[PDB]
Each structure stands twice: as C-alpha cells, then as structure tokens.
Amino acid sequence: LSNERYQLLSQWPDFTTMYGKDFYYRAHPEDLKKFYDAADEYYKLYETVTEFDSLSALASQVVPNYAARRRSTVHPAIGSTVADGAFTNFLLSKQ
C-alpha cells in the first residue's frame, strides 16, 4: 500500500523548476508563499511515505485484534455464513 501511495507521490510536478528569481518577482507574494508551502508539504509527504521502518510497528497494530478474533470459542475458521447455514439446519430440523 505504501508503494501505491509512493506511485502517486511519483507523479508530482517538479516545483524545483520554478525556484528561480524570474519566477520569484513576477509572482504575487501570497501565491509564492503558498507555492513554497506546497513544496515543504511535498517534502513532508515524501519523507513520511519512505519511512519503511515504521511498517513493522504498524503491522503489529493489526495483529492483536485479528488474533483475538481467531481465539473463538466455536472455531478459528467460523464465520457468519456457516453459522447462519447451521442455524438454518438447526431451526428447520425437528426442534
């Protein structure tokens, strides 16, 4: 999934091709401040999407709730469809 987000941080336009002072002084000051904030924002997004040493401790947050759902008192593989089909068998049998 981080590859899927990286692939759309890969199609970001090069703002570094508009840093020169001929683009500085032609532009409205608030638009240039917004442009430099947008460049700082891209550096934030790219610095955090390439923190791949965080994915292990992110995966350790999905493990305990899933692993507690598989400590079921009925069966590890039980679900709603099989339990509803077995209630269909149980209820439509002779009590």
Binding site: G20, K21, D22, Y25
Partner: protein
C-alpha cells in the same frame, strides 16, 4: 558572515567584504584555496558513509560543489534584476541629491 566563514575563518572582519564585495575572480581564487581540504574531507565522508547510496550522493554533491563555474552569480543569471538591485540604492541616493539641490 555565515557564507564567508567557510573560507576566511570565523573572525572574518565583515566590513571589508561589505564595503567591497568579492569579485568573481576572487570567489574563484578562494574556492581553489580550499579545494584540497574539500576533496580530502569528501573522500573521508564517502568512506564513512552509511551506505554506497550516501557515498555516491556525497561525491556527486561535492563534485558539483567543487567546480567553481557552478557558483551561482546573480548578475550572470539575472542581469536585469541585478541592475534594478543597483538602482534600488542609486534611486534613494538620487532622492537625497534632489533634496540637496532643492536646498
């Protein structure tokens, strides 16, 4: 002073380089005054880099930052901007001279 202490040490006497800034040939001649220590320090950094990616990044950034032609001169890049930067002080000097000619 921050961009001048890289060359001339920390106690740099900023008034000489504010009264008369460095001509391009003096910027070149004090880049080359410190080129050997830059080369040896960059080789020592690319040896002790954490990975060969960082080692190649160190040597590439240094071999771009060691060629003295790559010093960005704002007068060569933007000549008609540096002319307006000159007229930005010559205009208020002219305003002072206009007041003194009125007096």
């Amino acid at each position: 002073k921050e961009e001048l202490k890289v060359i001339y040490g920390d106690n740099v006497d900023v008034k000489h380089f504010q009264a008369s800034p460095r001509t391009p040939v003096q910027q070149l001649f004090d880049s080359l005054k410190n080129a050997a220590a830059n080369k040896e320090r960059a080789a020592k950094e690319a040896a002790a880099a954490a990975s060969p990616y960082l080692a190649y990044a160190v040597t590439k950034k240094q071999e771009v930052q060691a060629d003295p032609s790559n010093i960005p001169f704002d007068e060569v890049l933007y000549p008609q901007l540096s002319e307006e930067l000159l007229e930005l002080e010559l205009s208020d000097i002219r305003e002072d001279e206009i007041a003194l000619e009125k007096a």
